[PDB]
Swiss-Prot record, chain A:
Changing residue 181 to A: 76% loss of DNA-directed DNA polymerase activity. 60% loss of RNA-directed DNA polymerase activity. Changing residue 381 to A: Almost complete loss of RT p66/p51 heterodimerization. Complete loss of polymerase activity. Changing residue 161 to D: 16% loss of DNA-directed DNA polymerase activity. 24% loss of RNA-directed DNA polymerase activity. Changing residue 181 to I: 29% loss of DNA-directed DNA polymerase activity. 46% loss of RNA-directed DNA polymerase activity. It comes from Human immunodeficiency virus type 1 group M subtype B (isolate BH10). Changing residue 61 to Q: Strong decrease in RT binding affinity for all dNTP substrates and in catalytic efficiency. 100-fold decreased sensitivity to ddNTP inhibitors. Changing residue 68 to V: No loss of polymerase activity. No loss of RNase H activity. This is p51 RT. Changing residue 61 to A: Strong decrease in RT binding affinity for all dNTP substrates and in catalytic efficiency. 100-fold decreased sensitivity to ddNTP inhibitors. Changing residue 394 to L: Almost complete loss of RT p66/p51 heterodimerization. Changing residue 290 to S: 31% loss of polymerase activity. No loss of RNase H activity. Changing residue 180 to N: Loss of pyrophosphorolysis (reverse of the polymerase reaction). No effect on RNase H activity. The record marks 381, 394 as: Essential for RT p66/p51 heterodimerization. Changing residue 177 to F: 70% loss of polymerase activity. No loss of polymerase activity.
Length: 407, 546
């Protein structure tokens, strides 16, 4: 197999990212994993004249250890010229299918040799404990998983293998982000799960192994809910006027002038106020403008996506994906169900993973998260529930919400 | 001098080798220089060159701390050479070593000149000895001193040279570090002293001198500002100077020695001393000392009066860390496997953020400790913590951030960690309702604070030297002073609602501290927010008054 030559955007040097300190147990797994990989030829040890680095993590895919490499920085310095040169185009029909299964085709890439001159930028380090020894240094010889260039370069083979199945099933959508195939149908869950096993077998009998379901039918911007109460108070009309005043930044056709006169004198907080004719009229007129979606909100394929998450309590977290302030392209709420075997970081981690998949299905790119968590805390435990092969970008919003209940 | 395989080296892309002009220097040294070039050329570490593709680098000389020495300034070649992997930034921490009966410290001499230089790269190390007028034209064949590539290449060479000797002796353990090797073994002193002799004979077959046992160092070991003792470790003797005036420089060098000692001497406090350093001015001004700073330093002198020690690590024993409060936003921890001997100690201070509370600082301390245990021992400890389950369950349920709390057991040692108050989450029935507001003028900086209550009560207080921020908390403080043990405050300012709902128990502002004192006294407080200037009923009045 001849090698596809690979070039960074000119004036860009290779990545040099610090390796994160690891548990002894995790270091053992990497050294085991990497010893097998050196034998099968996939990676090789390197010298001190290779200055680049890329972090390595150890996750659990299971009772066996998978290795995960954080190619985020090397993706920015090469693939940004490989969304253009060898880019994989995104079908806007996939979000509209009733069911969507996700298949892991990451093994394919490991057969294909990597351009000899590019290998130096795949360098990574297995760290040692207590700086006992400079770590073990490796670089790749095959198409590495998690690099965004592996599926660009393997596209032609993948298009060829898939096409006999695309012919038999012209109504199935197959999309490839990184190391994963998204297959979306309109079949009944029974027939969808059949077709998927057909594709799994077609794939397996062409030499492509995969380990052995979403429904983007209720994926829209969830509407703002005004609490419906049988009786009201001074406090409840203050909470109501405060919410509607904030919504006026989103739906500018909201009038609160009628509800605010309804508590005219300085009155005790718990004092019960019945509402006038013009009050319920301002309440119901505002309920109809708040169940109908926004005007002017369009995906921009040049700006980044941004996902903000807020903690709600009792295993509930709500999220908002936008590109400009207040023009929310998508909103939702995620709830776990892991009893008392669920903790705050398990729940936030699954939230991030679920948000990133919805983002991939809808737009073919992942957001950058504004995460509510101490930075060092996240840099320590995120890998304990990370089941995915990609890694989104994130920063840490140490500023609190103060809003919360408004979502 | 070594048969080591060279490491290929390039120049930074689209650059070329250093072409500098040698300055005329005093002949007293020029002849002192050739007594080095010939005695180096005879050992092969350089070689004379002709006029072919000559770049040049300057060269100097100076006396000795008896034998004049040579200097080559590679500051220009260094700029043009490729980049290399970075040599070990950190070092092992003695808390983390595991005792090995016999330990031997070998320092290889001539280390960079024992290692050869990649052939096609030698021509860019060319340098020239002058005359009065021709000139001697040399170049290097080994890793030149103070070249950018020398440390990382030498480290890798040495590592490769050890590799066959380790594969024969899996019994013994070698730590590498700069030009030193530290060899430890659970071998009886005769087997150990024989193995060390095998090693030195191995290294000399690759061209690497090592000291003879007449020169082998002996414990205690003074390494990287430590005292390494056969069963215990500690820092070097600390010396705190006694000066009348104190330079901004002088304060830096003291908070230095003090932080260093906190690894092992428990109790060191460094808050007030670096509060003085918050001047951030340049480094000769004589900063005056405060009384609290003068007290803290006194207390540190009383810890440092006696000497204290640390044990080494034992992988068969559990890892336990303990945390105790010191009140001033200052926390302290000891890490031990045995209750009379610590592995190490240390402190944590929340010098980030203007308002905080104790539980959040406790959590941040647990976090510092977990990062550090991973670095040093490859695991996390079991925590002995001065706080109770019902306290912590309550805070991390009601917190906005996600938090991760390891298994911990409650050690009942005062001062404990508690929640000193909690805001009500729904308005209090049968409590007055204060509609506070406040306002100030950005130029005059006069402003005012007042409230209006549902019971017809009304106050207004004038302020001087304030801000819309100060006077908005001043309104709330006013409603607290003037009310029952249960009170319903209603405010229009997001800033003031932000501080309070964070539920701090300590702050920089005395205003916020006074508000905290009032909230601890109250028996129930409900705080509530309404949009400012939205004619809601209640605020409108205050705004007028204020
Ligand atoms: N000058 C100097 C010097 C010596 C060492 C050092 O010693 C060791 C060398 C090999 C294996 C284990 C070692 O320590 C185990 C605990 C122990 O007992 N150490 C020696 C003390 F008891 F003397 C380790 C790290 C840096 N060093 C710097």
């Amino acid at each position: 197999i001849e090698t596809v030559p690979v070039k960074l955007k000119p004036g860009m040097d290779g990545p040099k990212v610090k390796q994160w300190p690891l548990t002894e147990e995790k270091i053992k797994a990497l050294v085991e994993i990497c010893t097998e990989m050196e034998k099968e030829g996939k990676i090789s040890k390197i010298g001190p004249e290779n200055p680049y680095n890329t972090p390595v993590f150890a996750i659990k895919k299971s009772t066996k250890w998978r290795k995960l490499v954080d190619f985020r920085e090397l993706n920015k310095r090469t693939q940004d010229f490989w969304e253009v040169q060898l880019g994989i185009p995104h079908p806007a029909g996939l979000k509209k299918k009733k069911s969507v299964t996700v298949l892991d085709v990451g093994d394919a890439y490991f057969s294909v040799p990597l351009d000899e001159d590019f290998r130096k930028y795949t360098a990574f380090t297995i760290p040692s404990i207590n700086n006992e020894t400079p770590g073990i240094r490796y670089q790749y010889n095959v198409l590495p998983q998690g690099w965004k260039g592996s599926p660009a370069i393997f596209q032609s083979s993948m298009t060829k293998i898939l096409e006999p199945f695309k012919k038999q099933n012209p109504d199935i959508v197959i999309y490839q982000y990184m190391d994963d195939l998204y297959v979306g149908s309109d079949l009944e869950i029974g027939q969808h799960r059949t077709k998927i096993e057909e594709l799994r077998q077609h794939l397996l009998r062409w030499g492509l192994t995969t380990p052995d379901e979403l429904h983007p039918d209720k994926w829209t911007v969830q509407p703002i809910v005004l609490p419906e109460k049988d009786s009201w108070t001074v406090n409840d009309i203050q909470k109501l006027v405060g919410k509607l005043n904030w919504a006026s930044q989103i739906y500018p056709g909201i009038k609160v002038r009628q509800l605010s006169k309804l508590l005219r004198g300085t009155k005790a907080l718990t004092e019960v106020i019945p509402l006038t004719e013009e009050a319920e009229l301002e309440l119901a007129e505002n309920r109809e403008i708040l169940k109908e979606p926004v005007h002017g909100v369009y995906y921009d394929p040049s700006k980044d996506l941004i996902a903000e998450i807020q903690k709600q309590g009792q295993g509930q977290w709500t999220y908002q994906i936008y590109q400009e302030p207040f023009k929310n392209l998508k909103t939702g709420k995620y709830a776990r169900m892991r009893g008392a075997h669920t903790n705050d970081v398990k729940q936030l981690t699954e939230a991030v993973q679920k948000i990133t998949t919805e983002s991939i299905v809808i737009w073919g790119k992942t957001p950058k998260f504004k995460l509510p968590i101490q930075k060092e805390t996240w840099e320590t435990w995120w890998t304990e529930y990370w089941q995915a092969t990609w890694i989104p970008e994130w920063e840490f919003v140490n500023t609190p919400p103060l809003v919360k209940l408004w979502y | 001098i070594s048969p080591i395989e060279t490491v290929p080296v390039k120049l930074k892309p689209g650059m070329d080798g250093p072409k500098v002009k040698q300055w005329p220097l005093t002949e007293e040294k020029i002849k002192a220089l050739v007594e080095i070039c010939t005695e180096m050329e005879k050992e092969g570490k350089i070689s004379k060159i002709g006029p072919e593709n000559p770049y040049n680098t300057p060269v100097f000389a100076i006396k000795k701390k008896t034998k004049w020495r040579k200097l080559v300034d590679f500051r220009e070649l260094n700029k043009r050479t490729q980049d290399f992997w970075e040599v070990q930034l950190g070092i092992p921490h003695p808390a983390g070593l595991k005792k090995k009966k016999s330990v031997t410290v070998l320092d290889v001499g001539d280390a960079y000149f024992s290692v050869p230089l990649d052939e096609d790269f030698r021509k860019y190390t060319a340098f020239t000895i002058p005359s009065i007028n021709p000139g001697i034209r040399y170049q290097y064949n080994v890793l030149p001193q103070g070249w950018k590539g020398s440390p990382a290449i030498f480290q890798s060479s040495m590592t490769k040279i050890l590799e066959p000797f380790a594969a024969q002796n899996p019994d013994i353990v070698i730590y590498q570090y700069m030009d030193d090797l530290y060899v430890g073994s659970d071998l009886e002193i005769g087997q150990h002293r024989t193995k060390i002799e095998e090693l030195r004979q191995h290294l000399l077959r690759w061209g690497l001198t090592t000291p003879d046992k007449k020169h082998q160092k002996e414990p205690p070991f003074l390494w990287m500002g430590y005292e390494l003792h056969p069963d215990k470790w500690t820092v070097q003797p600390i010396v705190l100077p006694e000066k009348d005036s104190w330079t901004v420089n002088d304060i830096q060098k003291l908070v230095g020695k003090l932080n260093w000692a906190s690894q092992i001497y428990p109790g060191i406090k460094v808050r007030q001393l670096s509060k003085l350093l918050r001047g951030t001015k340049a480094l000769t001004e004589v900063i005056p000392l405060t009384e609290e700073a003068e007290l803290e330093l006194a207390e540190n002198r009383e810890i440092l009066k006696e000497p204290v020690h640390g044990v080494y690590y034992d992988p068969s024993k559990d890892l336990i860390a303990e945390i105790q409060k010191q009140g001033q936003g200052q926390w302290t921890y000891q890490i031990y496997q045995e209750p009379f001997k610590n592995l190490k100690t240390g402190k944590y201070a929340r010098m980030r953020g203007a308002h905080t509370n104790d539980v959040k600082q406790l959590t941040e301390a647990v976090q510092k400790i977990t990062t550090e245990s991973i670095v040093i021992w490859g695991k996390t400890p079991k925590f002995k913590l001065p706080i109770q389950k019902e306290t912590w369950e309550t805070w991390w349920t009601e917190y906005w951030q996600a938090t991760w709390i390891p298994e911990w057991e409650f050690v009942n040692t005062p001062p404990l960690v508690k929640l000193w108050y909690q805001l009500e989450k729904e308005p209090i029935v049968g409590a007055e309702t204060f509609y506070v507001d406040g306002a100030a003028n950005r130029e005059t900086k006069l402003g005012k604070a007042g409230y209006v209550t549902n019971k017809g009560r009304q106050k207004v207080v004038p302020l001087t030297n304030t801000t819309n921020q100060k006077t908005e908390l001043q309104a709330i403080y006013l409603a607290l002073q003037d009310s029952g043990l249960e009170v319903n405050i209603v405010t229009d300012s997001q800033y003031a609602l932000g501080i309070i709902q964070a539920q701090p128990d300590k702050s920089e502002s005395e205003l916020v501290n006074q508000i905290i004192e009032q909230l601890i006294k109250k028996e129930k407080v409900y705080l509530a927010w309404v949009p400012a200037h939205k004619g809601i009923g209640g605020n409108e009045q205050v705004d007028k008054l204020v």
